[PDB]
């Protein structure tokens, strides 16, 4: 049963336009879980992809797109059922934008990587409504703005309940 897991920044319900590949910032207490993470495919949107301007190193990258694929690199999906067809036995997929990416796969979807980054600039896409009953945070933390730190955060983890 595989984990298909959001990954987003947000500021409000505002997609953030993250400058890492992976859009997140994860605690320290949390680091050791990035080792997990990479070799697990990622699902990304057309423009997503081309704002990378690479593949993600080491994983399986599928790419959602109506137009022809533009990199040998990547393998390209033409809807959320294909794309997920190719993760194959792929424990955890991770799905990572933009906007309409994340409406059509949140049905589907069981878990989510959200980190909260209010003071920054939302982009020009709302991440999708979810429902507060099925939805259980099971791991959040919150840290301040420091040296270290430009902008607080919180980082939750939600998965379906």
């Given at each position: 049963a595989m984990i298909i897991s959001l990954i987003?920044?947000?500021a409000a319900d505002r997609v953030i336009g993250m400058e890492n590949a992976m859009p997140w910032h994860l605690p320290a207490d949390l680091a050791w879980f990035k080792r997990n993470t990479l070799n697990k495919p990622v699902i990304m949107g057309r423009k997503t992809f081309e704002?990378?301007?690479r593949p993600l190193p080491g994983r399986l990258?599928?790419?959602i797109s109506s137009?022809?694929?533009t990199d040998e690199r990547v393998?390209?999906?033409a809807s959320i059922e294909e794309a997920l067809a190719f993760a194959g036995n792929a424990e955890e997929v991770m799905?990572?934008?933009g906007g309409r990416v994340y409406k059509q796969f949140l049905d589907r979807a069981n878990r989510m990587y959200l980190t909260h980054i209010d003071?920054?600039?939302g982009g020009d896409?709302?991440?999708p409504d979810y429902e507060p009953d099925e939805w259980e945070s099971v791991f959040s933390e919150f840290h301040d703005a420091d040296e270290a730190n430009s902008h607080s955060y919180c980082f939750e983890i939600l998965e379906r309940r």
């Open positions: 987003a920044a947000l704002s990378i301007g990258n599928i790419v137009q022809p694929g393998t390209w999906a799905v990572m934008g003071a920054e600039v896409t709302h991440f």
